Amino acid sequence: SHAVKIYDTCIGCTLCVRACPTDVLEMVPASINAAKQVASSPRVEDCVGCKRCETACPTDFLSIRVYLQDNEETQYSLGLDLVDWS
Amino acid sequence: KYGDQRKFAAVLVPLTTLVFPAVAMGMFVLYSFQEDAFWRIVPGTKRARELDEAWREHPLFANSKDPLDGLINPDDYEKGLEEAWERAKPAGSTVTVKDKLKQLSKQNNPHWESWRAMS
Amino acid sequence: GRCASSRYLQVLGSIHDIECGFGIDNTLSLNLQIFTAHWGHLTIILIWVSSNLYHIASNANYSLWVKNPIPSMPIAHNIWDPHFTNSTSTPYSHTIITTILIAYSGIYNQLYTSGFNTINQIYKTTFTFSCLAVISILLAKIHINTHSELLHKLASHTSQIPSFFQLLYFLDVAISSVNIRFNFHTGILVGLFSIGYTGHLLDITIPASRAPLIHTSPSYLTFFGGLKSNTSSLYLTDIAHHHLAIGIISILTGHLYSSFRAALGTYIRDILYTSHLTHSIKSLHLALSLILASCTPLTSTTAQHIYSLTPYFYLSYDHIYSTALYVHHSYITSFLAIASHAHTAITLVRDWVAPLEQESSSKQIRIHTHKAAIISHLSWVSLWLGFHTLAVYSHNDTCIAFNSPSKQILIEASNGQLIQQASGKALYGTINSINNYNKSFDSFIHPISPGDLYVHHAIALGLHITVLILLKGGLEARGSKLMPDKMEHSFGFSCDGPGRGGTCDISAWDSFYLATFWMLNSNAWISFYFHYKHLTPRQFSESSTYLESWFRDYLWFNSTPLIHGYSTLGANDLSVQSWSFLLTHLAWASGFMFLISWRGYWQELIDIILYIHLKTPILINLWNGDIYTPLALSIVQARFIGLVHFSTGLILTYPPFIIGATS
Amino acid sequence: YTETVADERLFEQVYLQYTSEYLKGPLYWHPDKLQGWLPDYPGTPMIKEGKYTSHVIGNLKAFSSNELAFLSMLFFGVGLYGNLQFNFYDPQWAKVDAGGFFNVSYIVESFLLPISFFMHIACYIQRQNGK
Amino acid sequence: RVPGGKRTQELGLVIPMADEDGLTDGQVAGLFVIALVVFISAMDLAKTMYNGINPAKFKTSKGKGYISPLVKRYIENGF
Amino acid sequence: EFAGGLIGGQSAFASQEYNFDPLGLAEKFPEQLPFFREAELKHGRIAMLAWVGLVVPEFVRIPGPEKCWQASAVDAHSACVXXXXXXXXXXXXXXXXXXXXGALTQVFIFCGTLEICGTWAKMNPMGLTMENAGDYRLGVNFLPDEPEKVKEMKLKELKNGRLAMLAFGGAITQATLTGSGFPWLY
Ligand code: CLA
Ligand code: CLA
Ligand code: CLA
Ligand SMILES: CC(=O)O[C@H]1CC(C)(C)C(=C=C/C(C)=C/C=C/C(C)=C/C=C/C=C(C)/C=C/C=C(C)/C=C/[C@@]23O[C@]2(C)C[C@@H](O)CC3(C)C)[C@](C)(O)C1
Ligand SMILES: CC1=C(C#C/C(C)=C/C=C/C(C)=C/C=C/C=C(C)/C=C/C=C(C)/C=C/[C@@]23O[C@]2(C)C[C@@H](O)CC3(C)C)C(C)(C)C[C@H](O)C1
Ligand code: SF4
Ligand code: SF4
């Protein structure tokens, strides 16, 4: 599994949530921006690692950062279809 | 004759370039299916857990993984920090040093080293 | 859950990255593992030396080559391969006699110069070096046990005070101590090893090279010069005196640091703290980088001076030894040079602590403050050299294709000629003030022509670009404008995604991967320069200012004997050379697909193949793929495998050409 | 009261200012604070006040500035004399070439030139500290 | 031997071969004994490096450890 | 305190201290003062024995290797070592002499062994200080049990050693200049 971290610079775009193809991200209420909402990654075990969330993030440097961990890959982080690891 | 060393070659060359390599490949593919396979680079192996716990049992390396290890008298450090924060506390602020540090130590990263659950 | 097929590549990509080990918890374990690995590697080196000595002793003709070295050829080892013709006779054997290989290493001249005369001495030497390998392994075991015994002595260790935990940092003081290591290395391992080799020369090498003389009197220390006429090599007396001088100097220098007592010698930390350094000397990657950067000038000068001033008996009389040694050591030093930069980048990623934002105190800090200036000026000089070397070469090519050799731009190599003139005046003044003059220096100063100037500019271009790529990778390993968090990730990682413009080849490891191509190209240029000047100095001096000459009169022309090796007319003793030539071409081209074609295509291909396997009648009832799931190689693994194929092809394609052209 | 981001930043500043002073003291014990690491050796401070302390010159720390100046100039004269009388005037190469021996005095003296350079460096360092 | 390359043919360079054996079988066996010793010791070293240091030995192993008197001096001399 | 409080610096007119150190080396090198006193005592003892054995051979000469055991006290070193190969290097090609080899190198190796298991063993292993400078615990039972008696005996040893050093220098220089007998005069 990868590591998807959300930083304080988030401005509640919701673009990262919409771009995620495996429903890793979600919007949670907060009080650090005018949108009163920040992103969260409660399900990074389903994060394939496509980094579309990073493409969609418009902050100066990404408020959402995906750290690839190749020696950590699970069946969900690899998108295995022909083969089951469970 | 200049030959007569080929008596050694006719045994050694077939041996070390066919029998030994084949045995090595078979032993390697057998080793690949052990629970201990590549325990130093592959996460979540039993031997890695045992080695980490063995290190933690040593009296020198008990509090070795703690990034804050070193404070000889942590009570003195905490008291000094609390005193310094009291003189700089903004107006009627209700945050103390103790709970501030307690909540700054507790983060929410459930998916960190979750591979410590199989072996 | 379990792993996929990429586990093997992932594990083997960091199989020796002891910092990445999972059980390793402290610098004690890391340092002890590294020390034991050093012992094992020394054992491997000793076994390799004993191997060469044995094969020279058993499957070779040292006893006959020593008698008539100039026209004779040494034997590497016998050939025992059941694939050859069981009938007739191979081109590598004298009819019914066994099959042999000609040695191109140079050990024969080494042993002859060192004083070997008989096979029995070589056999005893092989036995002694195998003994030394045993000794090295036993020392590894000894040190593992001593450190484990210190660890066990921590069961009877307490300071009775909370400061007892300080002993955690001193457990590996045996390995991590620097002052003692520097003192004893520079003194013993350098100076006294040189002095012991002077003793060896005076006791054996000089006695076993001339008629019997006085009891090794101090007249054995001479100051003649170079190239003793009969053997076309340096005087053994000169070599002994050189080693004696170096030994004395390094023995005196070795008393510098505070090694065994606190009352003698200055500490390295205090030396650095009052200079333009004060780097983090506790980093193992930093030490490795700066000693690899030390073995690089040593190996490059070894390549240069084995050829320019041949130190071994009849080494210049071998047309293949001289080129093979130079090319080998040039490649070794290029690898070490790029290693130094790779480990500097790894040091910056892993083992460097930097101030907050502005404290310009560390040397790396000051370098990083203006890193953009460094990279911009390196790019400027690289662009200038490339533009003005390629353009002048193109001018010469075009004007010589147009039947106008006299329209070429030939800048006379005036600066190199001035340096050569000054050195020659100094050497001639040395020689003229001798009662035993008429000495020779072989190729210490060589004819320098406009072709030499252009090739030197090309070599400078290659070095500049290699340093540019490596230095940019090192300086931006911790963060660039494109990816301002690069020190949070590994030293090598795939990419940063297709967004933000696209981020292929963004890691510092990718900078190393790009720079290895330029290292190979610069080394190829240097080796081509040396080999072309070696084959025909006259034709190189005249027709080497236009690249078509390099293409035709060197590559196309000198490849005639190699391709003719095995054909539909018979075979030569170059058949292995031609077969390896073609095999290395195949290896070089095979790595193109690992570099050009990238993962996703192949991952889809592997999914299709896996579909087939899970669809084939018998396979599906034995193997569902859930155990060692076949997956396409990851991005970094793919780049590394393509780099390995490319490097192997480019490097190993050359020795067949060298052997075919010179022999 | 609610903890605004400015208040959190203020706590960051207070914590950092206090802890950076605390860790310098004798109560943090980090491996980077060992001898041979960043901090100076106990009794031998090298740089203070942005000036090379007297302990830099090692065993010469007790020497006076005048003594070091005299030694520096004397060693410069002797070493320069040795180098000039070995290289250009009175060459030894021809004499040693015919089986002779070097004028050992020249060889010993010529090594006093860099010694004189570092001696005058030490003289300046001593003068700065008032010794 | 069938030579290749221009220089070997145009200079007459030849590769002499000893008509004797080189090393007798006894000498090769003597070398192989020590090679086997190296091999056994190297397998043991590979095992020890693979398993690594065991810190928990002080709970089960006998003795009480030992720090050589020079190692203590090197500890307290600095770093 | 002068020179770390070492014996030897006190004047003889009493009520005064010669504390002779015009170069001030005691205050320049206080961490090597024990080594300085070790060197001073070693030089003094060697010079005492050297002066005694510079006078004695003028009367009695041990009958031995005639190559040595002959000549003036000056021509007794380079003669009793012979034309060694380079310096103190035994000729292994022709041991038993027959051309060139040493005759004192036995004294040299005995002195080396004694020195290493003497001064070197006193300083390197598990320790010399100001007070135990020349004290190798040799013949201390003969030393009287009184705080000032030991001090004055050590002072007498030191002053005899300094006198013997100066005396040996003068004696050997006069012998080289003139030859002659014990007076060492023109
Ligand atoms: C000379 C270099 C080289 C070689 C050998 C290959 C080989 C291959 N490519 Mg490839 N490729 C290359 C360069 C090369 N490529 C380059 C530069 C590119 C540009 C991007 C591509 C792009 C590319 C694509 C896009 C595709 C291929 C495909 C293929 C495969 C189809 C051919 C096949 O199965 O034959 C078999 C392979 C051989 C090498 C033939 C020789 C086999 C040897 C001689 C016999 C066995 C040796 C013997 C067992 C020795 C044992 C080993 C020893 C250790 C004991 C094959 C593995 C296609 C594929 O995989 O589809 C099936 C495919 O889709 N390639
Ligand atoms: C106004 C035009 C201009 C100017 C003044 C400079 C100035 C500079 N460039 Mg540069 N550059 C330019 C355009 C320009 N560049 C363009 C268009 C490119 C894209 C190819 C580059 C690519 C480039 C690289 C890759 C590098 C520089 C570098 C440098 C610096 C060293 C000098 C050098 O290498 O020149 C050589 C310049 C080139 C090789 C680029 C080609 C020159 C172009 C074609 C000139 C275009 C001028 C423009 C058409 C004028 C139109 C005027 C009209 C509209 C009125 C210097 C500050 C180097 C540096 O940073 O070192 C300090 C360096 O490594 N430049
Ligand atoms: C520094 C002391 C010293 C040194 C370097 C020498 C050196 C020499 N002596 Mg000499 N000698 C000495 C003291 C010394 N002597 C003393 C004190 C006496 C009076 C007994 C003599 C009486 C003497 C005679 C009669 C002759 C020499 C001769 C010689 C030469 C040949 C070596 C030999 O066999 O000596 C022999 C020396 C002795 C037998 C006396 C050894 C006494 C030693 C120094 C005392 C032991 C010191 C020991 C390490 C400390 C522990 C013991 C302690 C309790 C006393 C040589 C140049 C011979 C020669 O060729 O003369 C020209 C010769 O014929 N010596
Ligand atoms: C178990 C055991 O053993 O214990 C041991 C312990 C221990 C301590 C080792 C022992 C001892 C003591 C010993 C051995 C003491 C020996 C002392 C000697 C030989 C002193 C000689 C001094 C010579 C001088 C001053 C020369 C002075 C010469 C001078 C001033 C010459 C002056 C001239 O003007 C004169 C006279 C002539 C002129 O031409 C020039 C010169 C030469 C200068 C014991 C007793 O053994 C017991
Ligand atoms: C010659 C020879 C050899 C030799 C030799 C040897 C051993 C030579 C040795 C020479 C040696 C040992 C020479 C000592 C000199 C001591 C001096 C000058 C002391 C001056 C001391 C002075 C000037 C003191 C002055 C004072 O007292 C005054 C006036 C007032 C006092 O209040 C204070 C002071 C202290 C300041 C070989 C090489 C072995 C063999 C070769 O074949 C023959
Ligand atoms: S796209 Fe970036 S800024 Fe927008 S909500 Fe997601 S994480 Fe926050
Ligand atoms: S990397 Fe892809 S799967 Fe993972 S959180 Fe970002 S958008 Fe979702």
**Protein residue with least CA distance to atom 15, ligand 5:** F169
Per-residue DSSP letter, C574:
T
- Pairing between β-strand A64-67 and β-strand A3-6 as defined by DSSP bridges: antiparallel
A79 chain-C contacts, CB cut-off 8 A: none
E30 chain-C contacts, CB cut-off 8 A: 127
Output the six-digit token pair for E55.
Answer: 């810190």
**Closest Cα partner for C635 from C522, C509, C542?**
C509
Are A48 and C597 in contact by the 8 Å Cβ rule? The answer is no
The tokens for C651 are 């490097």
Q: With helix as H, strand as E and coil as C, how does chain E read?
A: CCCCCHHHHHHCCECCCCCCCCCCHHHHHHHHHHHHHHHHHHHHHHHHHHHCCCCCHHHHCCCCCCCCHHHHHHHHHCC
C262 close to F (CB below 8 A): no
> Determination method here?
cryo-EM
Angle ∠(D4,D5,D10) on CA atoms, nearest 5: 100
φ, ψ dihedrals at F33, nearest 5°: -60, -45
Which residue in B has a C-alpha nearest to residue C28's C-alpha?
B61
The CA distance from F71 to F78, in Å, is: 11
Measured from the Cβ of residue C460, the count of other Cβ atoms closer than 10 Å reads 15
How do strand A37-40 and strand A64-67 relate by DSSP bridges? unpaired
Q: Which two tokens stand for residue E35?
A: 């090679």
Q: Is the CB of C609 under 6 A from ligand 1?
A: no
Backbone angles phi, psi at F79, to 5 degrees: -85, -40
For the four alpha carbons of F166, F167, F169 and F170, in that order, the dihedral sign comes to positive
DSSP C478: T
Tokens of D127: 């003068």
Give the DSSP H/E element, type plus range, for residue C110.
helix C107-114
How does DSSP classify residue F58? G
Q: Which helix (H) or strand (E) holds C523?
A: helix C508-535
Secondary structure of C527-558 as H, E, C letters: HHHHHHHHHCHHHHHHCCCCHHHHHHHHHHHH
Amino acid residing at B71: L
What residues flank ligand 2, with Cβ below 6 Å? C 376-377, 379-380, 383
Q: Which of E70, D120, E79 is nearest to C268 (CA)?
A: E79
Q: Are C549 and C535 in contact (CB under 8 A)?
A: no
3-state secondary structure of C625: coil
User: What are the backbone dihedrals phi and psi of residue D45, each rounded to the nearest 5 degrees, phi first?
Assistant: -75, 130
* Cα F185 from chain centroid (whole Å): 24
Tally of residues, chain B: 119
Ligand nearest to the CA of F56: 3
What one-letter code names the amino acid at D110? Answer: S
Residue pair C14/C20 in contact (Cβ under 8 Å)? The answer is yes
Q: Are C511 and C469 in contact (CB under 8 A)?
A: yes
DSSP string for B1-42: ---SSHHHHHHHHHIIIIIHHHHHHHHHHHHTTSTTTTTTTS
Q: What are phi and psi of C627, to 5 degrees?
A: -100, -55
Structure tokens, E29: 């066996």
CA F41, CA F47: separation in Å to the nearest integer? 10
Q: Are C127 and E31 in contact (CB under 8 A)?
A: yes
Measured at the CA of C473, the angle between CA C472 and CA C475, to 5 degrees, comes to: 65
Whole-number CA gyration radius for chain C = 29
Q: Nominal resolution in Å? A: 3.0
Nearest to C145 by CA among E34, E45, B48, B57: E45
Return the number of other C-beta atoms located less than 10 Å from residue C296's C-beta. 19
Give me the amino acid identity at C58.
S
Residue whose pair of structure tokens reads 């010791």 in the numeric block: E41
Cα C593–chain centre separation? 27
In C372-511, the DSSP E strands lie at none
Give the span between the Cα atoms of B42 and C13, in whole angstroms.
Answer: 12
Quote the tokens at residue F176.
């080289």
Picking from F85, F88, F91, F101 by the largest number of C CB atoms within 10 A of its own CB, the best residue to mutate is F85
Scan for tokens 């490096």, then name that residue: E49
The CA distance from C329 to C337, in Å, is: 12
Choose among C529, C505, C562, C524: nearest CA to C647.
Answer: C524
Angle at E54 between CA E49 and CA E55, to 5 degrees: 140
Q: Does C218 touch chain F (CB under 8 A)?
A: yes
Question: Locate tokens 């300071």: which residue?
Answer: C159
> Quick check: F75 and F175 in contact, CB under 8 A?
no
Q: Amino acid identity, residue F173?
A: T
**Alpha helices of A41-85 — where are they, by DSSP H?**
52-56, 75-78
- The stretches of C546-629 forming alpha helices (DSSP H) are 547-549, 557-558, 560-563, 575-595, 599-613, 617-620
What's the rounded Cα separation, in Å, for the pair C313 and C235? Answer: 10
**CA C309 and chain centroid, separation:** 21
In angstroms, the separation between the Cα of residue C610 and the nearest Cα of chain E is 34
Among protein residues, the one whose CA lies closest to atom 62 of ligand 1: C605
**Amino acid letter for position F77:** H
Query: Are the C-beta atoms of residues C606 and C480 closer than 8 Å to each other?
Result: no
For residue C452, CA distances in Å to C49, C133, C325, C391, C558 come to 38, 46, 21, 16, 20
Which one of the ligands is nearest to C379 CA? 2
Tokens describing residue F100: 């060139």
Spatial distance between the Cα atoms of C147 and E67, rounded to a whole number of angstroms: 9
CA dist E9 and C494 (Å) reads 54
Cα A54 to Cα C483: distance, rounded to the nearest angstrom: 12
Select from D74, D85, D73 the least CA-distant residue to D110: D85
Indicate the SS3 state at residue C135. Answer: helix
CA of A61 to the centre of ligand 2 (A): 29
Q: Left, alpha or beta for C507 (phi > 0: left; psi -120 to 50: alpha)?
A: beta
* DSSP bridge pairs for C75: C102
> Closest residue (by CA) to atom 13 of ligand 5?
F169
Structure tokens that stand for C589 in this block:
């081209």
Residue C501: partners with Cβ closer than 8 Å, 6 or more residues away: C482
User: Which secondary-structure segment (H or E) carries A38?
Assistant: strand A37-40
Contact C62, C108 (CB under 8 A): yes
* 3-state class (DSSP) for residue C570: strand
Nearest to C572 by CA among A4, F60, E4: E4
Rounded to the nearest 5 percent, the helix, strand and coil shares of chain A are 25, 20, 60
Write C197-200 long-range contacts (CB < 8 A, 24+).
C197/C243, C198/C240, C198/C241, C198/C243, C198/C244, C198/C247, C200/C114, C200/C115
Q: Are residues C633 and C6 in contact, defined by beta-carbon separation less than 8 angstroms?
A: yes
Residue C71 and residue D99: Cα distance in Å, rounded? 38
Closest chain C CA to residue F31:
C263
Find the largest Cα–Cα distance for chain F: 65
Asked whether the beta carbons of D58 and D109 are under 8 A apart, the reply is no
Number of helices and strands in chain F (H, E): 5, 0
Say what angle helices C508-535 and C321-350 make with each other, to 10 degrees. Answer: 160
Q: Identify from D44, D54, D55, D59 which residue to disrupt to test chain F contact, counting F C-beta atoms within 10 A and taking the largest count.
A: D59
